[PDB]
Every structure is written in C-alpha cells, then in structure tokens.
C-alpha cells in the first residue's frame, strides 16, 4: 500500500495472508485474500498461475503482522486451489480470480472471532457509482522502489473510476474491460502496490461492507493516469457460486 495508514486485522477481519513454502523450507509472502465463508478464501489467479500446486501454500487469518505471529491467528493448509479457466494475461490480467479452500491440520475451517470474520459478496452487477470512496488492504510495498514489504498491515482509500474514464488511451485504453474496476486517488498519492494483489477492495454498498473488488494489476503504483485495476466481483457470482461447492 502506497501512502495511507497502518492498521490491524480488527479493521479488516476477513483479510487473508497467503504464503508459499519453497523447496528448501523457506516461506515467502505471495498475496492477500478475503474470507468469504468459513472454508473459502477468495484471491487473484495470477498470484498462483506459475505455481498452481495447492500443497505449497499456507493461509493465515487474524494476522496483523507479516513475519511474526498475531495473538488469535489461525494457520491453514490449502485443501483445494481453484483458478479461473479463462485467465489470460497481457498487461491486463483477465478473469483474475481464484478460490482457496482452507483447512487446518486439525481438519477445521475458520472459526469466527474478534479478529476473524467473513465479508459479504455484492449483489450481481451491483456496484457503487464512480467517485465512491472504497478501502484497500495489504502487506504490499509502501514505495514502488522498495525491496521489502512492510511488517505491519496497511490500508488506504481510493475512489472508483468510471469504465469510460479508465478506457481513455492516456489511461489504460483497451486493457480494461467491463469485468474490471479502476480505482485511484485524485492526486495519485495513494494506491495499492506489488504484494497487495488478491486483497480486498471494500465499498459501502447500500449500508453493508461489500467485497467489490480484488486487487489485480496496474502500471506501477501511485502513478499519474495509471489507476489500480481490480477484478469486478459482482460479475463473477455464478463462477464463485458453483466453485464454492468443490
């Protein structure tokens, strides 16, 4: 997250921290995700496309810190890693959405608590109007040039951009589709960045907190005329519905 503020898991209790175990024992951070039901985390396919093997991954819930344990956290193996069949990328990542079925060594899913809660999915094709302020959360870079990820969870606020504005050549041209959502800061001073992918774009939609988007792609970070691009969740409900029975 470029700019914004530091936070804890209590302020985004559905946030999932996804790690990969390497051949050798070392564990590295991959991407964020969102708990949508006790056994299901939703993320981005591009986070996993190169290493699609479920056994490599570890998922934490209730975790506020990157490389240290948070009191009350839960650790999970990935029982099933489901990637979107129609994924493709150019610069734009198409159909950038994945599902991770979570199971503890004890064979349990997520137990709701003060630091672990689910996020509601949106109603189909129901998104807030452009200019609406939404929040994004992640352990991603604080500066484009940074080598390290922050140790503490971060969040910021970006504003939804119309398909028409994001369509412009001096923005993203043809790269952005109707299945994607652009969001940015008016001054381009705050944004999601590398490491934030798979994480939640949350909007207040007719009274409730809603998983409107999933961090997907962008050209650099907090760059003028280059918004963050998010998978438009309300366009993938049938896909989410069928696959969450797998």
């Amino acid at each position: 997250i470029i700019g914004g503020e530091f936070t804890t898991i209590e302020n985004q209790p559905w946030f999932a921290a996804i790690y990969r175990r390497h051949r050798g024992g070392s564990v590295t951070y991959v991407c964020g995700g969102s708990l949508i039901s006790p056994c299901w985390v939703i993320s981005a396919t591009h986070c996993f496309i190169d290493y699609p093997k479920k056994e490599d991954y570890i998922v934490y819930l209730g975790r506020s810190r990157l490389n240290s344990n948070t009191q009350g956290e839960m650790k999970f193996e990935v029982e099933n890693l489901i990637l979107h069949k129609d994924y493709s990328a150019t610069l734009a990542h198409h159909n950038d959405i994945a599902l991770l079925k979570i199971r503890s060594k004890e064979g349990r899913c997520a137990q709701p608590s003060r630091t672990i809660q689910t996020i509601a999915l949106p109603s189909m094709y129901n998104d807030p109007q452009f200019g609406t302020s939404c929040e994004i959360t992640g352990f991603g870079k604080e500066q484009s040039t940074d080598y390290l990820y922050p140790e503490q969870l971060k969040m910021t606020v970006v504003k939804l951009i119309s398909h028409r504005e994001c369509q412009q050549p001096h923005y993203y041209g043809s790269e952005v589709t109707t299945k994607m959502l652009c969001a940015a800061d008016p001054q381009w001073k705050t944004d999601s960045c590398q490491g934030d992918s798979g994480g939640p774009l949350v909007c207040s939609l007719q009274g409730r907190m809603t998983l409107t988007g999933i961090v997907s792609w962008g050209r650099g970070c907090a760059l003028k005329d280059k918004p963050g691009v998010y998978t438009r969740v309300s366009h993938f409900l049938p896909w989410i519905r069928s696959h969450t029975k797998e």
């Binding site: 986070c47 190169d50 990542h93 960045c193 934030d196 992918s197 792609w217 962008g218």
Partner: peptide
C-alpha cells in the same frame, strides 16, 4: 520500475 515490481506479477518464475 519493470513489470516484476508491479501488481500482476507476484510469485512469477521470470521474476
């Protein structure tokens, strides 16, 4: 900043 430092290329072999 090259593509390997952008959102979209996390956990990629070429990176």
């Amino acid at each position: 900043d090259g593509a390997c430092s952008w959102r979209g290329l996390e956990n990629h072999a070429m990176c």
